[PDB]
Design a protein around this nucleic acid. Structure first.
Lengths: 191, 201
DNA sequence: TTTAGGAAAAATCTTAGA
DNA sequence: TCTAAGATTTTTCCTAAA
């Protein structure tokens, strides 16, 4: 009858806000908060949970974060619903996230009531749907890691991939966003 | 004995978390939440308040955000304490914030009890910068004229080689003068550098 | 403090197979 | 679209003069 949820974000203030937002609902059961992927994966089999609420930017090294994490959780925990909630407002990155066949996407902006609305929709969003009506997944991941401060070689090391590949993906992404240098790049990703 | 606070953050979920975290304290009175600076300044004189808990990034075009906002609030409302809670861990940005005389700074990470500690520190008329802030400021100081010129041209959008040709010195000289400046500002790579210089224009 | 030189690294520019 | 191995450009690293 009940439903168990797991929240995952590196901001403990966000964890507290989400947990207090879910205590408004009595059929929701918070079975654990997590701040990194390494502990999350190690505690997933121990908790028979139903829904996972997570962010893309997460400090992990063994299982990573972002798309690479989702593809993992979709492959090793198929009986798990995933609702990602993100803080950034990049239409390309967001798009690449929506194209992962997940059970909901929640922006942090304009979402005081629609997160319980999506949670109740899993029993069967609004602002993100209104904004719903372009970069590839790999380009979006490279730009997300680059925005957080990771260098090209650092991103290549974090993904077990070649530096030349990450350089080509980033540079092509800049050519597709009409951006000529790194300053305007971070200026765009921040906007 | 009481104390009025105003919360300002563009994340409504973070706003909700801060509101519920301040509900834990009964001598704190949340007199208003705001998600942009334009609505914050227009309602600042209407509410007599004591403390303003704010973030750096704010979607306000008329009054700005970050440093530009603080400089305004310190100049127009001097009888107001400012607690800046932020998400980023840039030592140079945080340092530039502390050099504006704020009543406390709190990282959003690892502060479930730190913000009430700072609020209680404002009772004795003291500031409170927790251990995380001190560790962030440990990596940081006066800058030289050459370093300021190189950081200028690199700030506009000039490459290292471009600056080397404009100043008619070598590439390695400009590289050294830039990397030393980043070593003195506590910045570790180029992304945090451009974040800093974009925050302090 | 400012200025570089050789060595090394980091990042890009081609060109190209899946 | 994703991936990457050359040549090539760009930047840094150690080191060291004044």
């Amino acid at each position: 009858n009940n439903m168990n949820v797991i929240i995952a974000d590196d901001h403990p203030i966000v964890l507290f806000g989400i947990r207090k937002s879910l205590e408004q609902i009595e059929w929701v059961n918070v079975v654990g908060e997590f701040e990194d992927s390494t502990a999350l994966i190690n505690n997933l089999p121990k908790l028979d949970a139903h829904v996972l609420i997570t962010d893309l930017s997460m400090p992990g090294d063994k299982y990573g974060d972002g798309i690479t994490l989702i593809k993992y959780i979709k492959r090793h925990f198929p009986s798990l619903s995933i609702i990602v909630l993100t803080m950034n407002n990049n239409p390309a990155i967001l798009s690449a996230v929506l194209d992962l066949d997940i059970e909901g996407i929640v922006l942090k902006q304009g979402a005081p009531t629609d997160l319980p609305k999506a949670l109740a929709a899993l029993q069967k969003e609004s602002v993100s749907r209104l904004l719903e009506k372009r970069l590839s997944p790999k380009e979006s991941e490279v730009l997300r890691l680059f925005a957080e401060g990771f260098l090209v070689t650092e991103i290549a090391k974090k993904l077990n991939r070649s530096i030349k590949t990450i350089s080509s993906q980033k540079k092509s992404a800049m050519m597709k966003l009409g951006v000529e240098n790194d300053i305007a790049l971070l200026n765009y990703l921040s906007s």
